[PDB]
Amino acid sequence: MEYRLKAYYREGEKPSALRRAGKLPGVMYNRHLNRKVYVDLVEFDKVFRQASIHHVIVLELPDGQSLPTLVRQVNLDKRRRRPEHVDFFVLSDEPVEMYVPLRFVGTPAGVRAGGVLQEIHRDILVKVSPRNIPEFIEVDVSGLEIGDSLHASDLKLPPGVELAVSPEETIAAV
Amino acid sequence: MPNKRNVELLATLKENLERAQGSFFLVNYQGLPAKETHALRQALKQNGARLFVAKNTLIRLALKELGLPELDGLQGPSDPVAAAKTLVQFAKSNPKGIPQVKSGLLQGQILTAKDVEALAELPTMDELRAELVGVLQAP
RNA sequence: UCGAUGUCGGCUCGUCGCAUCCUGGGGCUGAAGAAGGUCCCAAGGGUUGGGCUGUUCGCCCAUUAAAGCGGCACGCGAGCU
RNA sequence: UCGCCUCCUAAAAGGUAACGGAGGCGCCCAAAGGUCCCCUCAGGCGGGACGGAAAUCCGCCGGAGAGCGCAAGGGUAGAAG
RNA sequence: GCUGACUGGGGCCUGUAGAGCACUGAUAGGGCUAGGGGGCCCACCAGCCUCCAAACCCUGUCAAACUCCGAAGGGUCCCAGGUGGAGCCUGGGAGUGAGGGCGCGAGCGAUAACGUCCGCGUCCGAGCGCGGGAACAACCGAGACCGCCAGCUAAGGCCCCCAAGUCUGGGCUAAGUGGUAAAGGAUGUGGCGCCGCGAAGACAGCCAGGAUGUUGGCUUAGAAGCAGCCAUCAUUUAAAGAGUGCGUAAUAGCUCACUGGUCGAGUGGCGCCGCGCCGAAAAUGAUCGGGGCUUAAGCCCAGCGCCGAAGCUGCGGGUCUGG
RNA sequence: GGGUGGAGCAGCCUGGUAGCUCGUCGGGCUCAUAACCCGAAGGUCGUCGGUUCAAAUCCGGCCCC
Numbered sequence: 001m002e003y004r005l006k007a008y009y010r011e012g013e014k015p016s017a018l019r020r021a022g023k024l025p026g027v028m029y030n031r032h033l034n035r036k037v038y039v040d041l042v043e044f045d046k047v048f049r050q051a052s053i054h055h056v057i058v059l060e061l062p063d064g065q066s067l068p069t070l071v072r073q074v075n076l077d078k079r080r081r082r083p084e085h086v087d088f089f090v091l092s093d094e095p096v097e098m099y100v101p102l103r104f105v106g107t108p109a110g111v112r113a114g115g116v117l118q119e120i121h122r123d124i125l126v127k128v129s130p131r132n133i134p135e136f137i138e139v140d141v142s143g144l145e146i147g148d149s150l151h152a153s154d155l156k157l158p159p160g161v162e163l164a165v166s167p168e169e170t171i172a173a174v
Numbered sequence: 175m176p177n178k179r180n181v182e183l184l185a186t187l188k189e190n191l192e193r194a195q196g197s198f199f200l201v202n203y204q205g206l207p208a209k210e211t212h213a214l215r216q217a218l219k220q221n222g223a224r225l226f227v228a229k230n231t232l233i234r235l236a237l238k239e240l241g242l243p244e245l246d247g248l249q250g251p252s253d254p255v256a257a258a259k260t261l262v263q264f265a266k267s268n269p270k271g272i273p274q275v276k277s278g279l280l281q282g283q284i285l286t287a288k289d290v291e292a293l294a295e296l297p298t299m300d301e302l303r304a305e306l307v308g309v310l311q312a313p
Numbered sequence: 314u315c316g317a318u319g320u321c322g323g324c325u326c327g328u329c330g331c332a333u334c335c336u337g338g339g340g341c342u343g344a345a346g347a348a349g350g351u352c353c354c355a356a357g358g359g360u361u362g363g364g365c366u367g368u369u370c371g372c373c374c375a376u377u378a379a380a381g382c383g384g385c386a387c388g389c390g391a392g393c394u
Numbered sequence: 395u396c397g398c399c400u401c402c403u404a405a406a407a408g409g410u411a412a413c414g415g416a417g418g419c420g421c422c423c424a425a426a427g428g429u430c431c432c433c434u435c436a437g438g439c440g441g442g443a444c445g446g447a448a449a450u451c452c453g454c455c456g457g458a459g460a461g462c463g464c465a466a467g468g469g470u471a472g473a474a475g
Numbered sequence: 476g477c478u479g480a481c482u483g484g485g486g487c488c489u490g491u492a493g494a495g496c497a498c499u500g501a502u503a504g505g506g507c508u509a510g511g512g513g514g515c516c517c518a519c520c521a522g523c524c525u526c527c528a529a530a531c532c533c534u535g536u537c538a539a540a541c542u543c544c545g546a547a548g549g550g551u552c553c554c555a556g557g558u559g560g561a562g563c564c565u566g567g568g569a570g571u572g573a574g575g576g577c578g579c580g581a582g583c584g585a586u587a588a589c590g591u592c593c594g595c596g597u598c599c600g601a602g603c604g605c606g607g608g609a610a611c612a613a614c615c616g617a618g619a620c621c622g623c624c625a626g627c628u629a630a631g632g633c634c635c636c637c638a639a640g641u642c643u644g645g646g647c648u649a650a651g652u653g654g655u656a657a658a659g660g661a662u663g664u665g666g667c668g669c670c671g672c673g674a675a676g677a678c679a680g681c682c683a684g685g686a687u688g689u690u691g692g693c694u695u696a697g698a699a700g701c702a703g704c705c706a707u708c709a710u711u712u713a714a715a716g717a718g719u720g721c722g723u724a725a726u727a728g729c730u731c732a733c734u735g736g737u738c739g740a741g742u743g744g745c746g747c748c749g750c751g752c753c754g755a756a757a758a759u760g761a762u763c764g765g766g767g768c769u770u771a772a773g774c775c776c777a778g779c780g781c782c783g784a785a786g787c788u789g790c791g792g793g794u795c796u797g798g
Numbered sequence: 799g800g801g802u803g804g805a806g807c808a809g810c811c812u813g814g815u816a817g818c819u820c821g822u823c824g825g826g827c828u829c830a831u832a833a834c835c836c837g838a839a840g841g842u843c844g845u846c847g848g849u850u851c852a853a854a855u856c857c858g859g860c861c862c863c
């Protein structure tokens with residue numbers, strides 16, 4: 001699924017004030033473009049909580065545009081866990097790098113007897129065209145038994161994919 | 175607003191609205207005594223004889239909806255075989271053990287107004303009506 | 314403060330604080346009663362005599378409603394020792 | 395504890411205190427000195443009789459972490475080695 | 476005799492702040508694997524499998540004596556501005572060589588001291604002369620030649636002591652908070668927000684009902700939910716845990732899970748902000764300078780005025796120094 | 799700084815197993831003993847949380863000496 005954010009424009013406008021009005025500054029750039037932008041914080045949150053860079057945002061820019069983007073850097077204020085900038089990278093022809101969340105149906109579908117499983121569990125960086133963008137990728141067949149290490153060179157890899165990281169990290173552990 | 179898991183799984187289950195002669199249906203005070211009306215809990219696999227849920231659910235927005243439209247009874251809102259096993263399952267209707275197992279609103283298909291004087295407290299209609307052979311018919 | 318502000322203990326005279334030792338109130342109790350335990354309010358008054366040792370403090374004898382802890386130049390030597 | 399050297403403190407010039415932190419010098423070298431010609435480490439992986447983590451040898455890899463008589467710093471193979 | 480402090484523009488010099496892990500070490504978790512660590516059909520001696528476990532692989536950090544990086548500032552030279560109780564050179568006379576507080580950056584300390592020791596500034600010193608701060612060397616205002624019954628202001632103030640507003644608007648607090656000290660605590664209060672359920676009708680309450688073989692197997696003079704271990708079987712369900720409460724010579728009698736019912740609107744939870752509340756005990760008699768104040772004479776945001784010094788203006792005079 | 803089989807004490811350091819003596823028990827040598835040569839039983843190492851797959855054997859509190 002994709003989401004939308006209304007993405008207004010900005011040139012000067014001391015950013016400390018944008019915070020004092022509830023609007024989150026940012027930037028919009030890619031290989032052929034770079035412009036200064038800013039969003040409203042409130043709607044940004046209700047979106048990015050699930051936008052969670054793995055998914056695409058259209059931002060439906062004013063100026064008649066509707067510019068699809070993946071979020072690539074968020075500097076949250078070191079003090080209060082609250083964001084203070086957004087880097088909006090514009091998707092273009094093909095391809096990019098990105099992180100994709102994993103679904104788990106692996107071995108032994110949660111753990112055998114709760115003993116030594118303790119795997120490597122998060123999303124993963126992939127290279128893919130901007131079209132075959134998977135929502136999730138189920139960590140597959142559950143024959144990786146007690147003490148097996150079938151590393152990152154592993155499961156389904158939907159149509160658009162690349163070994164964008166160490167060909168073997170440790171995807172399954174002791 | 176998840177709206178009443180009953181109103182899907184127990185909105186009569188969209189069940190037994192049409193089944194069991196979808197007219198004539200039920201009445202009277204979803205129940206006072208758990209002391210004299212037995213015959214639940216014992217039919218060897220399930221009861222299927224007392225009630226399911228939710229008087230208020232259907233009495234408002236369950237329209238005519240596949241029965242037989244008739245009209246005469248007692249008042250407003252508060253078994254398969256029709257008009258025969260009336261008091262042959264439960265609720266012997268005053269006393270029944272706990273007095274005033276009172277009444278409700280009924281409508282079958284022919285001319286029923288009070289219905290505890292004619293068809294509820296165990297009358298004889300399918301065996302005693304054999305008096306049309308030489309009474310008022312044949313001299 | 315060294316062209317001096319006499320350092321401990323006792324005596325005498327006290328007065329003040331309350332983080333109350335007893336007395337009068339009170340809550341809880343694993344408070345039956347009685348008698349305690351603990352915490353709360355309360356500074357009005359009261360808070361003993363001896364043996365030891367310079368002692369303060371302690372430790373003992375016999376009692377008691379109880380033998381409260383601190384402050385005042387560890388109060389007080391132009392008042393005494 | 396007292397003079398000398400190195401680092402820190404020393405707040406991006408120099409300088410800067412304390413009974414602040416932590417270490418060295420009171421020598422040595424006729425070859426360790428001058429100059430000309432040469433040469434390049436330490437490690438790491440394989441291979442190699444007596445040879446082991448190492449003695450000596452061959453291979454490839456290894457821009458300096460070796461070495462520079464002694465502390466430390468700075469410097470350094472395009473050499474000071 | 477234009478050279479000075481300060482200033483502008485440039486040119487190099489630097490290794491702090493901050494950040495960083497590439498060196499130096501320190502470091503949490505996982506992986507993969509020397510060597511141990513223990514165990515095996517043991518000495519062929521090597522055969523696996525899961526705390527230590529070096530280097531490496533990601534993943535996260537720390538450092539005055541670590542730095543792949545690195546500002547601001549600072550130093551210096553040049554060209555300029557700058558005539559100043561500025562600069563330079565020769566020479567005469569000294570005094571001082573006990574400093575101190577405050578701000579910032581450190582070290583020693585206890586991230587104590589009106590503590591101590593350096594650094595940069597400043598001030599008292601010597602401005603204990605003037606206004607403010609109730610009082611008060613060094614905090615804020617301001618460098619006192621003398622005179623005047625003139626003016627305007629700075630800090631700070633304008634309800635009375637006490638000069639000038641009980642001034643204007645718009646919010647907040649009910650503690651005398653103001654006139655306070657913390658970890659923490661909690662239906663105080665006033666605003667912003669999120670989730671949760673609800674007109675087929677929810678949160679209060681007021682109507683009903685929680686019956687089985689019921690010994691729940693097991694316990695067991697008996698625990699027939701309510702002295703305990705529970706196969707917690709399931710006969711299910713308007714609904715009913717072989718039982719959350721009181722009950723208890725096991726039972727009688729009793730209540731709450733949960734649906735239904737009547738009444739018919741909001742309800743219950745989570746986070747945030749501004750202000751307040753508890754936490755809060757010390758020694759002569761109390762109090763915020765005092766009286767007194769609570770849509771303020773208290774706090775937050777605006778604004779208009781006025782008061783206010785030996786500051787600057789006005790007028791007169793004094794010397795000194797230039798022209 | 800000490801708290802260990804009944805008494806006395808090693809084993810901690812260097813964490814994968816608690817052992818000697820004496821006592822006790824039974825046997826060997828005696829003609830029968832004493833001693834002596836051999837084993838037998840028995841502690842969890844004051845106690846509390848942690849570490850580790852392991853700790854009386856590492857760490858820290860309280861305790862008693």
Ligand SMILES: [K+]
Binds near residue numbers: 314
């Ligand atoms: K004097």
Ligand SMILES: [K+]
Binds near residue numbers: 314315317
């Ligand atoms: K003196």
Ligand SMILES: [K+]
């Ligand atoms: K009491």
Ligand SMILES: [K+]
Binds near residue numbers: 356
């Ligand atoms: K008293």
Ligand SMILES: [K+]
Binds near residue numbers: 370371
């Ligand atoms: K004594």
Ligand SMILES: [K+]
């Ligand atoms: K006293």
Ligand SMILES: [K+]
Binds near residue numbers: 390
């Ligand atoms: K005297």
Ligand SMILES: [K+]
Binds near residue numbers: 390
């Ligand atoms: K005396």
Ligand SMILES: [K+]
């Ligand atoms: K030579």
Ligand SMILES: [K+]
Binds near residue numbers: 477
């Ligand atoms: K000039």
Ligand SMILES: [K+]
């Ligand atoms: K410069």
Ligand SMILES: [K+]
Binds near residue numbers: 496
């Ligand atoms: K590092």
Ligand SMILES: [K+]
């Ligand atoms: K001179």
Ligand SMILES: [K+]
């Ligand atoms: K100073």
Ligand SMILES: [K+]
């Ligand atoms: K001065």
Ligand SMILES: [K+]
Binds near residue numbers: 651
């Ligand atoms: K007050």
